[PDB]
Amino acid sequence: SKGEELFTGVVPILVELDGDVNGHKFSVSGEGEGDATYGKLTLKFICTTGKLPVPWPTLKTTLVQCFARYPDHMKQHDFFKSAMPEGYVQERTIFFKDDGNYKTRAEVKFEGDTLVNRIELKGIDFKEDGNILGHKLEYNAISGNVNITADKQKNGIKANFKIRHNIEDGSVQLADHYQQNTPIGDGPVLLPDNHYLSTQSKQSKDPNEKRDHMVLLEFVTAAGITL
């Protein structure tokens, strides 16, 4: 795709999120850079409204899959870069087992040289004393596979995957993710064969930062089709 060309170097990233979970409204801004040749993302996210009212790990999946490293033999399956620069809309529902759900809508597109992810998030049906609002999740590394399928009807893709968040008591909190992506333009995109994105991250802190924030280092690699 011509879009793929926009990702051959290091690209600045800007993320903006407006959230409302159970009436607790918050905003997050993120900045960093992506190097899709290596599937690599380095970002710092800041809560700009004060303290974040949900755990940072619950927002990781929401807070730019156009930065995945696609193997050469799979580059015909990279929907995300093929929709650039006009971009795509990503929507998810995230069901936290035995608790509430997030619904998200993200618009991902270039503004000049910067890849921008503008997100709205709504959470409903949460327990004030459950694992999310009651801050019971661990901050350990999240990894897993995002299973992608083509959606010819919307000229896009669907995806599904589960995140198993470790909880303090030693069990896990499931977050079942359902995803759709639709291009913004009218023209053709790459509609992929079934495959997945193998995604891993590590969370850290900026020692100089006094605001509530998270630093993330992430690698995203497409896989599952053999040469």
Is 33 a binding residue for Na ion by CB under 5 A? The answer is no
**What is the smallest separation between the CB atom of 8 and Na ion, expressed in angstroms?**
5
**What is the smallest separation between the CB atom of 155 and Na ion, expressed in angstroms?**
26
* Cβ closest to Na ion, residue 110 vs residue 178: 110
Give the CA count within 13 Å in the CB-facing half-sphere of 118: 7
**What is the smallest separation between the CB atom of 100 and Na ion, expressed in angstroms?**
37
* Cβ closest to Na ion, residue 36 vs residue 163: 36
Which tokens go with 169?
A: 């008591």
Is 13 a binding residue for Na ion by CB under 5 A? The answer is no
Is 143 a binding residue for Na ion by CB under 5 A? The answer is no
Name which position in 36, 157, 159, 190 contacts Na ion (CB under 5 A).
36
Name which position in 16, 33, 35, 176 contacts Na ion (CB under 5 A).
35
Interface residues with Na ion (CB under 5 A) are 35-37
